[PDB]
């Protein structure tokens, strides 16, 4: 029809391209934060120029990220204006729209500023109940919350999916009045691959939580217990499965909060994992039919063999009782016992075959 | 010994389950409804045979003594008659009730724990009451008479 | 702006899902099968009054340019023309398309966010094109075009 | 019309109004008890006048509450007398009716009386097994059982529900012979909102149990371990999920009984929570239909692409075998391997498509 | 008839009466054992005459119990001989029949004989890993296995059930070819009352296991930790639910074996308990219809109100735009926003009503 | 026909016979390794001739095992060549085919070579956090991975199954196209015997893991805690059920890894065990019909008794009210109360009977 | 004590659920339609007698006051008018309501609390209005009048 | 090598699973019943072609030697005779085995792993046995001959 159906596509491409730079500039800051946190503990102190450089980089990336977010929201407003048939952009503002933008800005505006600021930290040790005191730095409160920036991955994955950006799929969805949201794609992925998503989620959370616990716990720790990376991995793994704590209990409320979060997540996820595992152990239609065929084939032979022995024992009893001059009672008793055994076996086999046939009916 | 009046009332109450609309007699429909409510699919000929197997009166209906005899016989674990009458039907074909000697020889030579050739040969020699080679269930009662 | 060959290929592939046997035109049966496979139950009158709404040629069949317009209009989120027609149908009775003013006064006074009686009188003014006492859906289109 | 439907509604309104004052006068006493318990542990001793005032208030509220309970039961007897068609009120007394009234009075008649009474308390410490001895006060045995007054909330919620009080609802229920009790409303809430009530119940139990554990444990505790509010919250949370105890085991049977109760409740409630979680991760009818449509659409293209390669490989094999002067054996092997690969891919795709169609059938 | 059908009843009554004396004479011995074990720890030593008397009583009861068991098995053989056509009792002996009788005799033949015999016992303490050594007495190995005598309760319950002994029931079972096994009545009870049996089983196991743990643990214990009845009850309860051990870990393999048994039983029983619980919270087939009726009744009003709001907003927009000469743009934007809000509310209500109707279909 | 269908059978028999010698020569090496590991700790040192002999035997068995594996793969290649119609063996090589052969060779090529090689081992003790240092030997690293050779049992079981090797079964599978792989046999075993396989798997894993934990832990252990076989069995059992660790936490990462593996396996297997348990506590069709029959029979009598009780009270009230000269008010109230009680009982029993009939319909 | 306008409005809204198409009177079809969706299976005769039991006008229809009376009688817990009439139907068979004297003599001697022999004889002596032995349900109302 | 008694007995027992008529011959009814019991739906034409494909005798029935050949040919994994025969049917339209040259040129130019224009042109040139532009399935057997 011209103009339209091309303007919407142009806006779609612009919005999709604006969502990659945000991911790049967020992951850059997270990686630089991790490297600086690791290095400043033992390699250099907090007064060197390396810290200043590595934090100026973070500030620059944060500024660019905020600019990109604002431009993305402007493009989204334009797309709404086109879609709903509006002439003034002020019709878009609906309170919650402002609230979500402010929340995104606040979440993405946190990072360790350059400088040298310290505070006082006290904790109560585990299993001995002895107070501790140290002078930490403010850059540990401002660094952990960067992991909240990981929501952009979901946005990118939603905008790059084939279901969201296929003309035929959109036409069918419009015909059936289907709203394409981020929950629809999540449910679709869960239906398609319910194991891969769980594996990826668990493997990422494991490492992130282990590093966070170690970083929190390295301050009040002089025995290499909870500051060990492998020890943190073991602690997270055994708390996920809800087994216990061992001798490794955190001395910090940060570690305890992390442990509570992993415990909740594991209690939520184990049931789904075992359900999808149980769903992988059944037979399809064709193999079920083959199995039933072979079972009936074997049961017929078993029932025939069982039925023969009854007549065999009856004949033996009659012969040894009436066709012999003298009577030997031991043989008669043995044959009667075997006769009863044959009757019971025949009845059991017949009942099992009837039950299987009724089930297959 | 014998029976006291205490279990007579209980047996009468049990008999009342089949015996609907009073009249103290069990008909084919009354038995059929009870067997239908238990999940089985009873044929008319099977019901007639079942009622006539116990009805020594021959009137086609069951009274209290006939029901008592039927229950007493059926409450046992193993009935040596029906148990070995079922085995023959297992090998029976077309429901004729007659088995030729060749099938018996093959069955008792190959299937089961097997017997020696002379033993099965003597068994078939005794089995045919006339020698036509078509044995039936009349010879069955020969080993159960005593 | 405009449309380049890349989206033209996508739209042609999408159109191929409705138009079977390479006819190049969409018939009522072809649309009906697609709608049935989606779980809906479309009537023949629905399949006709849907296609004629987009068919500007009048031939009774849909080609590619008509399909483009239909998809462009349907892909939007809210269509103000259809929403308030549906709202009117909610209060409509026995499929006639006629609403008497007496019903409208009660609806717009006793339901929703209320309305002052002077406002309802002003609204019923010029609501009836002739003033007999019934309101149609033609007065609808009067307040859209502005 | 006949004195009916006018007297019954008046009695209903009287009974409904009498149930709010009881809730007010119970919550007042509970709040005052909590404040007095918190303040008497250091702000002032037990021999001051603030304690006397704050306990006289409790006694007054308790007396008024008992009066309101008696009047409510009198109105209930009147309603029964009208409902069942009786002329003497002595027909209502049916043993269990007296027993329930006596139990309610006994439950609502417990509170800390004014005075100064003390007793002796001994306990065995955890992880060290060392005896302890202290001089506690009686007002801790008499204060905890006030939380039994929380059934008035359920009574009010039942009396205020629209299902209980609606002419059309009651007419339908009478037509279908349905009784209107509290279990019906509870199961209706289960059907409507099975997550909100679970969340509210969990949070309220969490806070109440944490406070109770701290109040019990503050007596035999000199190291700020189990008499810490945050520590109590952590203990309750990790015992609910059945992970362990850490280094935080109570030295008192009160705390151990509370922990047993939370463990039982968590074992009961986790299964329901994870059962209702799974109901939020499935597609509706329209979503299922469009998903199946798109899956079949993609599978057709996949099977077409798979089928082309078989003919391609066959032609290449024939051309390189019987249409070239000199035979190269390094190419035919590769082409045959790719031929087998194409055959296997085609079979797999066809089987998957047939399985999906059979499932959708 | 013919002396029959009454002889079987007489044998049934004889066998039923012979099964009560065994229960009486087993419970007597168990109770006397418990009393003697409790009293010999502190009241009197092992050389007094009270121990001799209290063990001679046990020996007498054991002898009588063995005699009763033998007579019961003789009556069982008689009943088999009557039921299955037989004349010589030697046909009943079938190897496993002898094995079960020998097992019963061996189980019921264990008890603490009179005398004074001691042995040496060593253990490794928990949490400190320090060896211990004591001079115990033999009568602790011979007393615990007495709880194996509790199988007679199942026999009595099976022989006293109405299903087992009823002319109508036996006639129906014979007609349908049903074997009246001891598992049949267990399944029947599980179908009828799935909660009462679990409650009784749990409480009895709780008390018995707590007493057994205390009796085993009282030897190597000098700090009143695991030889406390309440502590044992707490340990059993928290191990049943699979929470942990706290600071209460047994120093004895007897306690550890008991704890393993309770852990296995709890892991097996909790799932059944929650499955039973989940069945008490759903509506019947007579109130679901009422529920759906009222939901539809409310939804109709909701959609009516939404449509009215849509029409009102449309009229207000038109009046404030095409009628008033001086155009005010502050009102038009608000009215358009409310128009969109009403449209969305109408669509949501319509979708919810359609979904409920479809699911009720 | 034309050496066809006989050549395939000959190759099948050769391949089946070649798979027993590998199992024999693997189990021999595993047993000899276990014996040598047990004996070299206390009986003789690492420099005696017994160690040299017991390691030369291992090397010989390993060489023979590798030869047998190579010959088996050659026969497999021959069978493929016959089966797919190929004429040159170079068509079988398909990358992953080479990779799996290399993996099997590498797995089966690991064993402790003769000699005397030692290394240094350090660990951090549990619950005390004290470093440890010892001079271990290299053979412990090389001995544990022999348990990877246990995959040959699955191969033997698959090759010896009747389903895999039966002309009628293969004909049916050819008609209804299916793949006769190991997953099919595993699913078949899970369908027919869902409990035996779990029992065998658990009982084998228990002992293997306990021995592995003991062998790892015996180096840094001087208090007989985690080096005890029974203690290791208890630790594995309580970690499988996810109860806790007690005072028994390994000082080695090998033990921690084993414990993690058992915890994962138990979390996976407990759900299946408790799901298959419930399948045994249910009634078949015939016993269900008998149960319903008897329930209806009893309910009819209960209804009759309730109705008679209802009718009696009305006559009693009428007699004591209108047919008596002097009115006694102490009897009419009791009779009216019993009248109401009978009415309620009648309603309850009628509702229960109707519900049972409706559910059985 | 008298009804106020709010309860009248609520009861009118409830009555609107039964009365469709704004007739103002409840018909048998209207009642049957609302009873069908509740899960019950109502017969035509049952509906006719149900509406006749309350309708004192005799026109075979229900207006607002009749609906009020029916609702007021139905919201109660126990109605001994019907509770003891149901018990008689429990024992009555063939749908005649003509239980003979022997049935009552057996029922109130071997069932329930086993009333004494002299009591039941007096009860039957009072029960028969004439003495024919067929005790009808007119004996029910005479123990209700006072 | 197949003359050994064990494999002959195995194959005779397998053959007995199809022939319920006793005589060593397989008819349409038995094959249809066996395939029906497996969950498939065989129409008359396809099964008739299936039995005719192995039937070299022309009698319309399968004996033991024919059963051996059928089982030997079907037990193998990949059958190059049918795998590409079905691949050709995938692109068929009306099942006549008649494919125009233009369709082949299109499929072997856009679909699959692509092909150079001269190569597909040469293949189509060789494909037409006469030049009518439509290819049958004898070109398949011409490729598979050597
Ligand atoms: Ca009869
Ligand atoms: Ca008779
Ligand atoms: Ca077309
Ligand atoms: Ca057109
Ligand atoms: Ca009407
Ligand atoms: Ca009327
Ligand atoms: Ca045949
Ligand atoms: Ca032939
Ligand atoms: K745990
Ligand atoms: K757990
Ligand atoms: K500890
Ligand atoms: K623990």
Coordinates of C-alpha atoms in Angstrom, one line a residue, chain F residues 303-305 307-315 318-319 322-323 338-340 343-344 347 350, chain G residues 77-78 80 83-84 86-88 90-91 107-108 111-113 115 119 122-123 126 142-143 146:
Chain F
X303 CA -30.5 -45.3 55.0
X304 CA -33.4 -47.6 56.1
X305 CA -32.3 -47.3 59.8
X307 CA -35.6 -43.2 58.0
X308 CA -37.1 -45.5 60.7
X309 CA -35.4 -43.3 63.4
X310 CA -36.9 -40.2 61.8
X311 CA -40.4 -41.7 61.7
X312 CA -40.3 -42.9 65.4
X313 CA -39.7 -39.5 67.0
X314 CA -42.7 -37.9 65.3
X315 CA -45.0 -40.5 66.8
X318 CA -47.4 -36.6 69.1
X319 CA -48.2 -39.1 71.8
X322 CA -51.7 -34.4 72.2
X323 CA -52.6 -37.9 73.7
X338 CA -33.5 -36.5 68.6
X339 CA -35.8 -35.7 65.7
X340 CA -33.4 -33.1 64.4
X343 CA -33.1 -35.7 60.1
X344 CA -29.5 -34.6 59.8
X347 CA -29.5 -36.2 54.9
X350 CA -28.4 -40.0 51.5
Chain G
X77 CA -32.6 -25.3 57.1
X78 CA -35.1 -28.0 58.0
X80 CA -40.4 -30.9 58.8
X83 CA -38.5 -34.1 55.9
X84 CA -41.0 -36.7 57.3
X86 CA -39.4 -38.1 52.4
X87 CA -38.9 -40.8 55.0
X88 CA -42.3 -42.4 54.1
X90 CA -38.0 -44.1 51.4
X91 CA -40.1 -47.1 52.5
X107 CA -40.5 -51.4 60.0
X108 CA -41.2 -50.0 63.5
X111 CA -35.6 -51.3 62.4
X112 CA -34.3 -48.2 64.1
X113 CA -34.6 -48.0 67.9
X115 CA -40.2 -49.3 69.5
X119 CA -46.6 -48.7 71.3
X122 CA -51.5 -48.0 69.4
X123 CA -49.8 -46.1 66.7
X126 CA -54.5 -44.2 65.5
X142 CA -52.9 -34.5 61.6
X143 CA -49.7 -34.7 63.6
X146 CA -51.1 -28.9 66.4

